[PDB]
Amino acid sequence: MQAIKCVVVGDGAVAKTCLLISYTTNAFPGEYIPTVFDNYSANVMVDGKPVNLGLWDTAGQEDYDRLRPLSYPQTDVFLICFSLVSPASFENVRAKWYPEVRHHCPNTPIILVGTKLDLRDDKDTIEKLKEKKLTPITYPQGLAMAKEIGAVKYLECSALTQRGLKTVFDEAIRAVL
């Protein structure tokens, strides 16, 4: 019986915390109760034996780049995250998140994950991005980013649908396994 370290970072403009809580809550889609605290955890069976795990929820505010790294050491796996519908999130991750995460921990299995996949194909959202001159950036260039790092997996999920979300965590925990 053992536990697994698992960190998640990302800008505060995507609310990955909602994803994490809705997963751990086993919440019905669009039914999660937002708690007042961070750093969620769960006890998970996937294969062979069940394990514990704690999700290092890290706020993406740039100032906290001095407390985020102290959590990094001895991390089993880290989950880099973004918003599939935010080009600015892409600029952040390829420019700030991915680089400094790679520098702090160049040696750890890594998986990149999309968000608002439901909004990725949302006609109103994509037309708003176009009229605001942002791009509904799609999967293949996400795969290009993955191959750029060679992250052991790249995934795309959503909160209001939880699609592949369970899967997301499955390959996340099987990264060690």
Binding site: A3, K5, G12, T17, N26, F28, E31, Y32, I33, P34, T35, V36, F37, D38, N39, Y40, S41, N43, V44, M45, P50, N52, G54, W56, D57, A59, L67, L70, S71, P73, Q162, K166
Partner: protein, 274 residues
């Protein structure tokens, strides 16, 4: 739906699933059990048309196993194993927390509208039984005000702290990672400050014209955070007993913010501590 058999049409059951079935895993498993496998999305209410319509409709969601009442244990300082047994088995009562918006949907705040319409579920028999599922014998719902909501959230957090404290208190060969988890989260209501949220919500006089007679609840919350304070104190000291150098900056932040909230509740919230 109506295609369901006589004993299934418009019937609600509770299933004692496997030890770690994620909700939709069991959902899919049931879908294997049943063709015309669709999901109504209004999880709470039934569908009056579907109360008679064909095309069997179902919906699934995890429920809360209401604790047992271990007899002759209600105040005994019993270990945890017995109660953890009693957390899952010999159960009939089941509640489901219902998010709701009731009030103004101000941007920075959600407790202007948080209302939890919990629904209790009482089944005829006790899980586990001869059958791994049972229809809910009697259904009833509840209500929770944002005052009340702050109440249960507050108290549940307090016990969760207590449970982690005791579980590490009896077993030393026990990972400190949960302590980092919990005490970090407690120290920073980071994405949103719950404490000041309660201050604006009820401690401010605005609520006390919204709830003038219902200020006997803000004092409840005041005593609740007052009783919080020593619980965080045990959290801090147990952290120190499990402290490490990586946790050391963490610990000093915890400690500084801990006396911060100490003096704040003492004077800023004005609450009287024990």
């Amino acid at each position: 739906g109506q295609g369901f058999p006589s004993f299934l049409r418009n019937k609600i059951f509770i299933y004692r699933g496997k030890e770690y079935e994620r909700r939709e895993d069991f959902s899919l498993r049931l879908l294997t059990q049943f063709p015309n496998a669709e999901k109504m999305t209004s999880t709470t209410p039934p569908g009056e048309d579907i109360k008679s319509s064909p095309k069997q409709y179902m919906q699934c969601f995890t429920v809360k196993p209401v604790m047992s009442l271990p007899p002759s244990y209600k105040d005994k300082p019993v270990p945890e194993q017995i109660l953890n047994y009693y957390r899952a088995n010999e159960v009939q009562q089941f509640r489901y927390s219902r998010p709701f918006r009731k009030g103004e949907k101000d941007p920075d705040n959600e407790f202007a509208t948080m209302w939890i319409e919990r629904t209790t579920y009482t089944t005829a028999y006790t899980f586990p039984g001869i059958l791994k599922w049972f229809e809910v014998k009697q259904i009833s719902t509840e209500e929770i005000s944002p005052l009340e909501n702050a109440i249960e959230t507050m108290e549940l957090t307090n016990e969760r702290i207590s449970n982690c404290v005791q579980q590490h208190a009896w077993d030393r060969s026990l990972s400190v990672h949960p302590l980092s988890m919990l005490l970090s989260g407690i120290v920073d209501p980071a994405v949103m400050g719950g404490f000041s949220n309660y201050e604006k919500a009820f401690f401010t006089e605005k609520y006390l014209q919204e709830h003038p007679e219902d200020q006997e609840k803000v004092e409840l919350l005041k005593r609740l955070i007052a009783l919080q304070m020593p619980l965080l104190t045990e959290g801090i000291r147990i952290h120190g007993e499990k402290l490490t150098e990586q946790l050391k900056p963490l610990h000093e932040r915890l400690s500084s913010c801990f006396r911060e909230l100490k003096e704040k509740v003492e004077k800023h919230y004005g609450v009287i501590t024990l």
